[PDB]
């Protein structure tokens, strides 16, 4: 083996297998999921129980794990369900369910403390003395790709100042229509950074892929995009997961590249096939059967050990272990 088990191809789950391994090796998220109060839940409809089941199978089973119950759990069963939705939406569906389950518990707020960050969106008038500052929260960042060669340029475009001129003048209310500037700057960055690479455009009638080259570094410094940086905790991040899609004319195959321990020892998770791969194969070779990298996961250097805690078999409560083994007994008969 390789110490990591795979997920079986069970229907049009698309990116679901890639996302599940990404959350599984978000080790701190995993231990929080194991300790959720899911005793007395209905197996046929419980997303927190389903995520516990798949994580447990991904930790103990020596054969690839099935995801049928989980697919039934959040009800994506229409023929186009997975291709119409986004990786972000599926991650939101799962993470909201788990975070909602953890409310009132000792591990409550684990999802916000791992993935959510603070951001300010501003609109500043240039001739009149008015400004509008509102705080936003984010769990994921959608990055522009066309015309941007690497993540640094991609982030510069995100913080680039937008202009609101005539025919788009901001409604300043008391000050009337105004020629303002609109922008967004980063207040804080989460310990686990979910970056979606928006490589598509929509002529014909379809959304096509932007197969352009786009570079992402193994180590991503982001202090300069913070409004005020913090010494002793620079916004330094380490690449963790690279979610890839392979691109013949219709096709579509979703695999994820991971260094689960953050040590730069990378593996390719092709569903049930988990294999070792070079760091060149995971990073440089995915810059762009046209394969394209569409989602990246970074972990802050200061938080790397805590986010990637060791997870032992005893971290799983005994009553959780008892219920899952009982289910496997029922299937074996």
């Amino acid at each position: 083996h390789t110490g990591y088990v795979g997920l079986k191809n069970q229907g049009a789950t698309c990116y679901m297998n890639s996302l599940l391994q990404t959350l599984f090796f978000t080790n701190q998220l995993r231990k929080a999921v194991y300790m959720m109060p899911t005793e007395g839940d209905d197996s046929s409809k419980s997303v927190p129980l389903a995520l516990q089941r798949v994580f447990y199978e991904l930790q103990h089973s020596d054969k690839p794990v099935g995801t049928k119950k989980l697919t039934k759990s959040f009800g994506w069963e229409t023929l186009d369900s997975f291709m119409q939705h986004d990786v972000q939406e599926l991650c939101r569906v799962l993470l909201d369910n788990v975070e909602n389950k953890m409310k009132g518990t000792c591990v409550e707020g684990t999802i916000p403390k791992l993935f959510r960050g603070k951001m300010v969106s501003y609109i500043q008038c240039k001739e009149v003395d008015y400004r509008s500052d509102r705080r936003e929260d984010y769990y994921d960042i959608q990055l522009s790709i066309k015309g941007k060669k690497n993540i640094f340029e991609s982030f510069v475009d995100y913080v680039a100042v937008e202009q609101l001129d005539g025919d788009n003048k901001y409604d300043a209310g008391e000050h009337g229509l105004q020629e303002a500037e609109k922008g967004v700057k980063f207040l804080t960055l989460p310990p686990v950074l979910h970056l979606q690479l928006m490589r598509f455009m929509y002529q014909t009638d379809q959304n096509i892929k932007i197969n352009d080259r786009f570079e992402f570094p193994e180590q991503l410094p982001l202090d300069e995009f913070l409004q005020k940086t913090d010494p002793k905790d620079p916004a330094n991040y380490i690449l963790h997961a690279v979610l890839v899609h392979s691109g013949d004319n219709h096709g579509g195959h979703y695999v994820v590249y991971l260094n689960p321990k953050g040590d730069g020892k990378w593996c390719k998770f092709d569903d049930d096939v988990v294999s070792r791969c070079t760091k060149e194969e995971a990073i440089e070779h995915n810059y762009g059967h046209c394969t394209n990298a569409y989602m990246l996961v970074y972990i802050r250097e200061s938080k790397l050990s805590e986010v990637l805690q060791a997870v032992t078999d005893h971290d799983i409560p005994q009553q959780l272990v008892e219920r899952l083994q009982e289910e496997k007994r029922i299937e074996a008969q």
Partner: peptide
Amino acid sequence: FFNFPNXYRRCGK
């Protein structure tokens, strides 16, 4: 996103 090519405009919103 990211399931291309497709004619769905719910991707990225």
